[PDB]
């Protein structure tokens with residue numbers, strides 16, 4: 001392909017410590033025709049707060065995806081009590097054509113922001 | 124005064140105004156692991172939605188508040204990223220309290236927040 | 245209500261209103277310098293109710309200063325930014341009500357504005 | 365680990381894309397209150413800005429990152445609320461570090477986070 005290897009990427013940040021959130025469980029699902037959620041993939045954010053090798057352009061077909069982020073375990077391990085059980089992000093993909101995605105989440109015990117930076121890989 | 128324990132405040136980051144008539148729907152977790160409806164409603168003119176529950180009815184358990192942020196953005200002729208915004212939390216496990224969910228929406232982003240008010244005694 | 249300018253601050257770590265946060269509001273003078281406009285600290289509710297009036301709140305640029313540094317330090321948390329500042333032009337397109345909101349964490353903060361309208 | 369001492373990244377919450385061509389001016393406070401110009405540039409196609417300063421030049425002191433967010437929106441035909449966005453922090457006091465100021469933008473809102481990390485050794 002071109003420059004990048006993976007179409008779906010997730011980046012998580014820590015607002016309390018101002019550092020990448022490492023070892024955050026991430027699990028993706030895909031709403032199958034019946035409306036059911038098929039286990040698409042699952043990884044753990046590396047030392048850079050990023051998660052690579054989730055899927056390939058061929059496996060990442062069109063449809064509605066669900067990205068779950070176990071933010072609860074993250075905070076517990078630290079000694080903090082968080083409000084949310086987990087951060088979930090639901091979006092439709094490759095509907096426009098076939099592009100690259102980036103999900104970014106910012107963590108805080110009682111709040112979190114998620115942002116998508118969708119980019120056309122061919123322009 | 125906080126009559127109800129659950130109140131949802133929504134805003135719009137691209138217009139500097141409260142997000143009105145946004146679809147909010149709370150689900151609660153069942154003993155077998157299901158999600159039975161708990162409340163429903165749409166945000167008023169001030170972005171706020173209250174009277175969803177009552178202390179009596181809003182008891183311990185895992186809750187899931189869902190906002191139809193998508194059909195909100197589309198009414199403005201904008202094609203958003205998210206299908207919806209969803210906040211899941213374990214309510215009143217530490218005893219009876221009052222919770223405020225605050226959302227700040229944008230076509231490709233959103234932040235949510237919890238303000239756990241402690242009851243007067 | 246009668247309050248044109250209002251500021252609401254929230255703590256994202258504790259998950260409660262940000263109390264005792266010093267706020268100083270400045271107005272830009274025709275001279276081109278910032279003249280002290282208003283001042284106060286967040287109440288229990290996290291908001292600052294009653295900064296100015298619909299009379300004294302004339303049109304022009306306004307600088308809002310939030311002292312998050314002192315806020316986080318009292319709690320023994322060394323924060324990042326020296327403070328959080330918000331600058332905007334007010335009323336150059338109508339006499340409306342401004343609400344500056346702020347959600348705080350040690351290494352990150354967020355601000356948003358709600359410009360309402362004097363209805364009836 | 366971050367290679368560049370101080371890097372700035374800007375995003376557009378509306379288009380869900382990098383905020384390109386945003387002007388960034390950095391200043392350092394002088395021993396007498398003054399605000400001398402330190403470095404400037406504009407965000408590339410990636411939304412991030414590279415080449416602000418080396419470690420030798422990035423001494424201990426207060427610094428302010430000014431982003432002309434107003435111009436970005438006007439060029440798009442939108443009228444923003446803020447005049448600009450400033451992030452004012454103290455750098456290299458607890459030791460020499462590598463920073464990254466990130467800002468998410470919207471016509472009426474902006475959030476900004478910092479990512480400090482100990483330089484490669």
Ligand SMILES: Cc1c(-c2cc(Br)c(O)c(Br)c2)oc2ccc(O)cc2c1=O
Pocket residue numbers: 111132134223224225226227234235236238252254345346347354355356358
């Ligand atoms: C503006 C605003 C916000 C707010 C501000 C920012 Br910045 C955010 O990122 C988020 Br998310 C929510 O939260 C509230 C919570 C309770 C309440 O009673 C009123 C408000 C309110 O008025």
Ligand SMILES: Cc1c(-c2cc(Br)c(O)c(Br)c2)oc2ccc(O)cc2c1=O
Pocket residue numbers: 011013104105106113114115232352373375464465466467468475476477479
């Ligand atoms: C998306 C994004 C964000 C980000 C996401 C959300 Br949601 C926010 O509310 C804020 Br504030 C910042 O921060 C970064 C910080 C350092 C870096 O190297 C890259 C990034 C990045 O790519």
